[PDB]
Write an enzyme that holds these catalytic residues in place. Sequence first.
Site, PDB file in Angstrom:
ATOM      1  N   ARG A  60       1.098  -1.098  -0.269  1.00 31.54           N
ATOM      2  CA  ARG A  60       0.768   0.278  -0.023  1.00 31.54           C
ATOM      3  C   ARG A  60       0.973   1.612  -0.420  1.00 31.54           C
ATOM      4  NH1 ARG A  60      -4.782  -1.012  -2.238  1.00 31.54           N
ATOM      5  NH2 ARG A  60      -4.933   2.007  -1.380  1.00 31.54           N
ATOM      6  N   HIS A  97      -6.387  -2.588 -10.408  1.00 31.82           N
ATOM      7  CA  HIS A  97      -5.164  -3.277 -11.731  1.00 31.82           C
ATOM      8  C   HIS A  97      -5.458  -3.645 -12.618  1.00 31.82           C
ATOM      9  CE1 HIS A  97      -2.275  -1.337  -8.938  1.00 31.82           C
ATOM     10  NE2 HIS A  97      -1.727  -1.652  -9.484  1.00 31.82           N
ATOM     11  N   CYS A 104       2.614  -1.586  -9.826  1.00 29.26           N
ATOM     12  CA  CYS A 104       2.732  -0.996 -10.833  1.00 29.26           C
ATOM     13  C   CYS A 104       1.826   0.531 -10.254  1.00 29.26           C
ATOM     14  CB  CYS A 104       1.879  -1.745 -12.377  1.00 29.26           C
ATOM     15  SG  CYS A 104       1.789  -1.191 -13.495  1.00 29.26           S
ATOM     16  N   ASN A 118     -14.183  -4.609  -9.485  1.00 28.64           N
ATOM     17  CA  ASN A 118     -12.409  -4.749  -8.725  1.00 28.64           C
ATOM     18  C   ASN A 118     -12.003  -6.336  -9.284  1.00 28.64           C
ATOM     19  OD1 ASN A 118     -10.062  -4.647  -8.454  1.00 28.64           O
ATOM     20  ND2 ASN A 118     -10.438  -2.828  -7.402  1.00 28.64           N
TER      21      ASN A 118
HETATM   22 NA    NA Z   1      -7.509  -5.632  -8.922  1.00 27.40          NA
HETATM   23 ZN   LIG Z   2       1.281  -2.863 -14.815  1.00 28.00          ZN
END
Ligand code: NA
Ligand SMILES: [Zn+2]
Lengths: 162, 162
Positions: A60, A97, A104, A118
């Site tokens: 985090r 993500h 990333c 998500n």
């Molecule tokens: Na995710």
């Molecule tokens: Zn990435």
Amino acid sequence: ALTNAQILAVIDSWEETVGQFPVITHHVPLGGGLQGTLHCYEIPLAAPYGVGFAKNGPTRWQYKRTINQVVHRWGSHTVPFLLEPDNINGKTCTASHLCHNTRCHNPLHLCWESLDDNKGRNWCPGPNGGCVHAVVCLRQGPLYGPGATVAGPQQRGSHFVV
Amino acid sequence: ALTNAQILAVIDSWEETVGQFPVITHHVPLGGGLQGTLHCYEIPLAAPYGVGFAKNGPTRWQYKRTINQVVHRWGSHTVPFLLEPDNINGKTCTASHLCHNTRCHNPLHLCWESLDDNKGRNWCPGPNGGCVHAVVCLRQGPLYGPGATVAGPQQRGSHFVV
DNA sequence: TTGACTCTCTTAAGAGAGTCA
DNA sequence: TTGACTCTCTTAAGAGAGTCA
Ligand code: NA
Ligand SMILES: [Zn+2]
Ligand code: NA
Ligand SMILES: [Zn+2]
Ligand SMILES: [Zn+2]
Ligand SMILES: [Zn+2]
């Protein structure tokens, strides 16, 4: 901060700093037996991480800036979406993500959606395997598969029906 | 503690009580635009729930039996699997609702697998929509679909590439 | 031996805010 | 002002254990 022109300034400096994080190439399953290539901009494993970034948890991070002598702080992956609505249908929007790589920070690998939307990408077949997400997945979810179920539906007597 | 024969008796009494729970007929999506029917045996909304049953949370319950003066208690959905391994791949096995109806205790609607495998079924296309689970789904996950993404991958400048 | 309550904990996707230098 | 740490919380899929009559 508070003004439209101040937000844009926070987003620009953010992109600028993240654009210097080491770029790592990752080959990934796309579904349908096909393979692709993603380029992630990864935050370093230990300090220093970059101007304005600090680690608040194993995976985090937070980004902070001093505006009018008042410091503002946001989740490290939320900055690109500071001008969008913070909720949808009463649900909280989160940074998702598409690359399934927590370190990333590449904004081309992130989207803004409910926590349910998500999570679900973890099991998506992929852009070349059946993905039906309005905002298409960049790869096949790392959890997609037959699974490893130990025991299925069963009964000893005769009191139930499907 | 309990012998195999004793555990079987516990599963038999559980099935006998749950079998008398109100049976509700539900019409559900199976994927491919097809519609199916599931028969759920639903635990009451308030006490009394049935012999041996007690609520420990808004949507959590436990089943308990006293054998040879010693009290035994289990999660209410875990009973059908007391004779199966309790972990797989270093992961703890959990009761998974194939019908996505928490109050249902119908063993023909439950399986025993990891929490990750369990959760994933919320986004499965269904038995008639492309499900690849070795232990097939009974219906289409309630969360499957295009989603409701507020914002997608974007950048203001040009520091990034996919 | 039972029923009807009480409490906190696990995971892996996500967050907020305080203490020091 | 900026850096490097510390702490606990949210969600929706799931859990174990205590008190009292
Ligand atoms: Na995710
Ligand atoms: Zn990435
Ligand atoms: Na489930
Ligand atoms: Zn997808
Ligand atoms: Zn059911
Ligand atoms: Zn399935």
